Design a binder for this molecule. Sequence first.
Ligand SMILES: CNC(=O)c1scc2c1OCCO2
Length: 119
Amino acid sequence: YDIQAWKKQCEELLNLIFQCEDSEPFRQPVDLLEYPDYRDIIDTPMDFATVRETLEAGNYESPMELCKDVRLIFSNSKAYTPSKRSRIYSMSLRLSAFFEEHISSVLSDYKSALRFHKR
Ligand SMILES: CNC(=O)c1scc2c1OCCO2
């Protein structure tokens, strides 16, 4: 019932994601010189370095906020791809399945801790 435990658990999960080859296209902001139409399609850019920096600055109040920003990385990939068979889109679908498998317990444990605090 530790209400603060989610933060280290999210740092550890981000470390795993940065070690995965599938994260390489998503580690820094999309290069607008390589993709000059990107901002015509995508309203709010997001990347894993921006997520890690926001966490380490103390600017997430909950793991649900972190999870909304990671899911925006994946929805931006789905919106920008020209094909459901593209290389980079393929990489985002595998990384999303890995992220969702690992974040589920983080969210469950945090919500349980809050309910115990309010009991
Ligand atoms: C050649 N580019 C692509 O097929 C795709 S699919 C998703 C993307 C991306 O390039 C930029 C990053 O996000």
